[PDB]
């Protein structure tokens, strides 16, 4: 009856055990929202998209700062400020990436709403397993848990890197030391 994460709180009604990373940590009861097209399905899809985006962004920042930029690309070690140097010399790359992300996000929203309507697609599912790393069950749950935990950690990390780069105008590991 009590949430596993917060023993002083009752179990959130909509979070039983199903989703990976579920420990009952919903103090504000946001999982019970059923308005403005927002429900547990939409919240989970948003959480998974945030997890994946944060993982990609944190990996990119760390890669560029440690191993350096790719040939022909600007340096500076400040990832929040090197973006304007890339846009100053290769605006077409940024524009094409933005257009591609826009199209993919329109497709993602359509897929999310459709799967919410005629329930056949789990939240965050895009059938993207080209290498077959999660075919069999009893490993899919473990992979989902790993992805969720890594994505939450990378969300926090990427938000921290964004704020550090905006404020200190220095690199992430530069702030570290």
């Amino acid at each position: 009856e009590r949430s596993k994460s917060l023993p002083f709180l009752m179990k959130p009604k909509n979070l039983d055990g199903s989703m990976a990373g579920d420990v009952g940590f919903d103090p504000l009861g946001l999982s019970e929202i059923n308005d403005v097209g927002v429900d547990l399905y939409w919240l989970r899809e948003a959480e998974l998209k945030h997890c994946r985006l944060g993982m990609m962004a944190a990996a990119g920042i760390l890669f560029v700062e440690i191993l350096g930029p790719a040939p022909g690309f600007p340096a500076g070690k400040s990832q929040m400020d090197v973006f304007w140097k890339v846009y100053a010399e290769k605006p077409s790359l940024i524009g094409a990436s933005l257009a591609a992300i826009a199209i993919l996000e329109v497709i993602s929203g359509v897929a999310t709403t459709q799967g919410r309507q005629n329930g056949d697609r789990a939240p965050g599912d895009y059938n993207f397993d080209p290498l077959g790393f999660g075919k069999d069950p009893a490993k899919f749950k473990d992979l989902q848990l790993k992805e969720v935990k890594n994505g939450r950690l990378a969300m926090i990390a990427a938000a921290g890197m964004i704020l550090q780069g905006v404020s200190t105008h220095q690199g992430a590991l530069e702030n570290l030391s």
């Binding site: 077409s92 497709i107 359509v110 897929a111 056949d120």
Partner: protein
């Protein structure tokens, strides 16, 4: 359910299997409120127009017709051809063809039996049975889509950088 192209999206519910080049790609559901034959005709018309346009752009940046008016790049050829009246002739004959097309598409939508884009233009055969016709229709659709995207890229690159045939 679970359209072939986008495996996580539902089938567009208007494209089951009985159209050439039908991989179930309609995420925004254009076929849900527009006739399928109308959209097919529009797509095939775009394919043919853009194939001709890409070939003409690339060729005219290499080979020029005799005369001083034909000595401009394809990027600047529009303002020269419109002034000389060269594009007026193309406009006149294209308008004639498109009025006949108005009649044809109206008849196709109101029964008839004319397949979308089927003008029966076939001096040579190149398509003897149903299988050959289907294969060549798929080839035409794929080549036309590729040429539409290719002309888009060619025009955008040439406008961005006023370069010759290599528009990099």
């Amino acid at each position: 359910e679970k359209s072939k192209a986008v495996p996580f999206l539902p089938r567009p519910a208007a494209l089951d299997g009985s159209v050439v080049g039908d991989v179930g790609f309609d995420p925004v559901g254009f076929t849900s409120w527009l006739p399928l034959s109308y959209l097919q005709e529009a797509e095939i018309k775009h394919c043919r127009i853009a194939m001709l346009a890409t070939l003409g752009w690339i060729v005219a940046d290499f080979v020029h017709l005799p005369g001083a008016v034909h000595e401009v790049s394809s990027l600047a050829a529009h303002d020269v051809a419109v002034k000389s009246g060269a594009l007026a002739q193309i406009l006149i004959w294209t308008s004639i063809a498109e009025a006949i097309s108005v009649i044809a598409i109206s008849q196709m939508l109101e029964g008839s039996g004319r397949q979308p884009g089927d003008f029966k233009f076939d001096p040579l055969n190149f398509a003897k049975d149903e299988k050959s016709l289907k294969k060549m229709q798929l080839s035409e659709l794929k080549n036309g889509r590729l040429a539409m995207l290719a002309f888009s890229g060619i025009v955008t690159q040439a406008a961005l950088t006023g370069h010759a045939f290599p528009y990099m």
